Structure formats: structure tokens, C-alpha cells
Amino acid sequence: MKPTVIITGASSGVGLYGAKALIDKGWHVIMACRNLDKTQKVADELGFPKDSYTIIKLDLGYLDSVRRFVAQFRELGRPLKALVCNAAVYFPLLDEPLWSADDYELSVATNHLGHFLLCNLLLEDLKACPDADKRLIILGTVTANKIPIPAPPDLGNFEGFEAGFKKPIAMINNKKFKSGKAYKDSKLCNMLTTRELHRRFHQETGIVFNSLYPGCVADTPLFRNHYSLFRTIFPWFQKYVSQELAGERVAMVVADDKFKDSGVHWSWAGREAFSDAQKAQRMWDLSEKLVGLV
Ligand SMILES: NC(=O)C1=CN([C@@H]2O[C@H](COP(=O)(O)OP(=O)(O)OC[C@H]3O[C@@H](n4cnc5c(N)ncnc54)[C@H](OP(=O)(O)O)[C@@H]3O)[C@@H](O)[C@H]2O)C=CC1
Ligand SMILES: [Cl-]
Structure with missing residues (x-):
């Protein structure tokens, strides 16, 4: 059988072009x-x-x-x-x-x-x-530590998660809803998840657990409408990686020999190994409760 990879959200952007690149490399997507x-x-x-x-x-x-x-x-x-x-x-x-x-x-x-x-x-x-080389890749943030969301993430003490996170709770720290920050918070949780998967499971399973920043993939729908609104208001700026190249970078980190170390963040590749550690553990324990794993 062709080696098999699951890609979530493969109908647009990075996921779609990642599927394209992995198909080209002989995978079943x-x-x-x-x-x-x-x-x-x-x-x-x-x-x-x-x-x-x-x-x-x-x-x-x-x-x-x-x-x-x-x-x-x-x-x-x-x-x-x-x-x-x-x-x-x-x-x-x-x-x-x-x-x-x-x-x-x-x-x-x-x-x-x-x-x-x-x-x-x-x-x-x-x-x-049964393969020796098996990988779980999470799409993450620029760095392991504007476009067009200025606000930094901030999980506080996970007060929103602790209280069960149900509506009307709208943020992980239980403060007032902000849609840009909500996105940033979620992506930090993605990064923390990678850190925890590696810590909890790499030694036991041999599976590679890494995160990826493919570049600024400006043509995708994700940030497109926000950027165009920003340029409509501030027409002072020129209009970066193509969707095709971002996809090829996904394919590399999934399939290629150079990307076999676990617990790292690949950025465009620059490599960063992983208090984020303590926050990551809490994110994990509380997320288990929220998704019904316990
Ligand atoms: N664009 C960028 O510059 C950057 C993106 N990233 C990350 O890369 C990843 C891909 O982003 P990008 O390609 O830009 O985004 P797109 O908007 O192009 O694609 C998003 C994909 O996610 C899918 N999706 C959304 N909601 C759900 C759901 N509820 N269930 C299943 N699938 C869903 C979409 O499905 P549908 O087609 O139905 O909408 C779509 O296929 C993201 O994790 C993003 O955070 C990271 C750094 C920069
Ligand atoms: Cl097959």
C-alpha cells in the first residue's frame, strides 16, 4: 500500500496543496x-x-x-x-x-x-x-515562544477552561470575547499540544511530534478578507509563500529524512526545540476534560 496520511482541512489553502504535494510523492491522502x-x-x-x-x-x-x-x-x-x-x-x-x-x-x-x-x-x-517512521504534524505559529492580528495570545490561568468552557464563556482566560485573540489563543494551544505530545509519547512510541510554520501564505482565504479590508483603509502598502510552496513544505516535514527529529518547530527551515512547559501541561489536562477523554 501507498503510505497513508490524514490531512485535516484539505479543501483549501495549505491543506489542499499539502495533499497535492504528498500525492505527488506517492502517498495516499x-x-x-x-x-x-x-x-x-x-x-x-x-x-x-x-x-x-x-x-x-x-x-x-x-x-x-x-x-x-x-x-x-x-x-x-x-x-x-x-x-x-x-x-x-x-x-x-x-x-x-x-x-x-x-x-x-x-x-x-x-x-x-x-x-x-x-x-x-x-x-x-x-x-x-508497523512503519519505523511515523509523524504527527501540527500547523502552528511563527515562533515557538501584525498578520493581521496585533494582539498576543494569553491563556491566563485557563479560567475559562476551568469553569468548563461552555457558552456564555468565550475565551480560555474567561475574559471578554475578541475574535482575533481567540484565533491566536487557539494557535498557541496547537503549539502547546505538540510540546505535550512529544513529552508524553515520543519515548514510549517513537512517533515524531512536530509543529510547522510554512510561511506567510497570504493568498489563502484564512486572512484574505481581513488583509483586503486593512489595505482598503491603509492603501499605503504593497500586496510571503505561494500556496503550492507551503504545501510542499508540509510534504517535506511529513515525508522527508531531514525532518525526523521530534519535539521541534520547523519554521521558514529554521529549527526550534521545545513556563510554556507548565502552561502546556495544564492546557493538556483541562482539554482532556473538555473533549471527554476522562
Ligand atoms: N495562511 C497563513 O498565512 C498561515 C496559516 N497557518 C496555518 O495553516 C493552516 C491552514 O491555513 P490556511 O490554508 O491559510 O487556511 P484556509 O482557510 O485556506 O483553509 C482552512 C481549511 O480548514 C478547514 N476547516 C475549517 N473549519 C473546519 C472544521 N470545522 N472541520 C474540518 N475542517 C475545517 C477548511 O474547510 P472549508 O474548505 O470547508 O472552509 C479549509 O479546508 C491553519 O492551521 C493556519 O493556522 C499558519 C501560518 C500562516
Ligand atoms: Cl494503495
Whole structure:
């Protein structure tokens, strides 16, 4: 069998072009996507050969969808060599929070909590795969420590998580909703998750747990509308990596020999090994409760 990789959010941007690059390298890509009609359309638009991918429904904003995705993946009987947590949402300048299917603020629910559950469930599949080289890659932040969200992340003491994170709670630190900061908070949780996966499981399983910053992928829909609004107001600036190159960088960190060290953040590659350590442990323990692992 072709080596098998799951990519969340493969119907757009980095995920789509990562799928393209991995198909080109001889992998079978599981396009783990929420909109099946869209996903099929875009695969066909790029000429993806149907013998090299499978589309399976996944809605990261619905924890039971995550569980069903895993079950449906397992029915294929393909051993899992790699997982890429790529999917994300961002709601620019959104004054009132949106809610997941589980009544969790939608940015954190989708970007972090769904992935957090997915990683924990699929750890069994990665363990069962007999390959020596198996990898779990999380799409992260620029650095392991503007575009166009000025606000830094701040998880506080996870007061929002501690109180159970249900609506009307809207931020991890239980302060007032800010949609840009909500995105940044979620991405920091992605980075902390990578740190914790490595710490908890690398020695026991041999699986490689790394994070990736592919570059500023300015053409994707994620930040596109925010950037165009910014340029409309401040017309003082010129209009960076292509989607295709960002995808090729995903493919490298999944498949290539140079990227076999675990517990690092690959940035464009620059390499950074991993109080973030203490915060990461708390993020982990509380996230388990929120996603029903305990
Ligand atoms: N763009 C950039 O400059 C940078 C991006 N990143 C990271 O790279 C990753 C990809 O970003 P990018 O390609 O720009 O984003 P895009 O908006 O192009 O793609 C996002 C993907 O995530 C999917 N997705 C969103 N919500 C869900 C859900 N609930 N369930 C399943 N899938 C979902 C989308 O599905 P659908 O097609 O249905 O909308 C889409 O396929 C993200 O993790 C982002 O944080 C990191 C650094 C820079
Ligand atoms: Cl095959």
C-alpha cells in the first residue's frame, strides 16, 4: 500500500496543496474535510488521481464528528503513517462569539479542541502502524515562544477552561470575547499540544511530534478578507509563500529524512526545540476534560 496520511482541512489553502504535494510523492491522502461537495470539486480541479486519496467527513467543531471520522477512517483498513492537523478557522472583527456543536467558542473549539481529541484518538492508529517512521504534524505559529492580528495570545490561568468552557464563556482566560485573540489563543494551544505530545509519547512510541510554520501564505482565504479590508483603509502598502510552496513544505516535514527529529518547530527551515512547559501541561489536562477523554 501507498503510505497513508490524514490531512485535516484539505479543501483549501495549505491543506489542499499539502495533499497535492504528498500525492505527488506517492502517498495516499485522507482528505478529512467538512464539505464533501467542495472537497471533491477542488480535488478534481487540481486533477487529483482518485486512486491516491479518500474524502472522509470531518467537522472539527463537533466532537462526535471527530469520533465518527476516526471510525470511518478505520473501516478503510489502511495503516496510519502520518497525521497533519492543518484545519483552522478565523472570524475577523466578529463582535459576538460563534458556538460549536458542543457550545464551545468556535475558534478554539475547531482549531484546538477538535484536533486535541483527534490526536488522542489517532495515537492508537499511529501506534498500530508497523512503519519505523511515523509523524504527527501540527500547523502552528511563527515562533515557538501584525498578520493581521496585533494582539498576543494569553491563556491566563485557563479560567475559562476551568469553569468548563461552555457558552456564555468565550475565551480560555474567561475574559471578554475578541475574535482575533481567540484565533491566536487557539494557535498557541496547537503549539502547546505538540510540546505535550512529544513529552508524553515520543519515548514510549517513537512517533515524531512536530509543529510547522510554512510561511506567510497570504493568498489563502484564512486572512484574505481581513488583509483586503486593512489595505482598503491603509492603501499605503504593497500586496510571503505561494500556496503550492507551503504545501510542499508540509510534504517535506511529513515525508522527508531531514525532518525526523521530534519535539521541534520547523519554521521558514529554521529549527526550534521545545513556563510554556507548565502552561502546556495544564492546557493538556483541562482539554482532556473538555473533549471527554476522562
Ligand atoms: N495562511 C497563513 O498565512 C498561515 C496559516 N497557518 C496555518 O495553516 C493552516 C491552514 O491555513 P490556511 O490554508 O491559510 O487556511 P484556509 O482557510 O485556506 O483553509 C482552512 C481549511 O480548514 C478547514 N476547516 C475549517 N473549519 C473546519 C472544521 N470545522 N472541520 C474540518 N475542517 C475545517 C477548511 O474547510 P472549508 O474548505 O470547508 O472552509 C479549509 O479546508 C491553519 O492551521 C493556519 O493556522 C499558519 C501560518 C500562516
Ligand atoms: Cl494503495
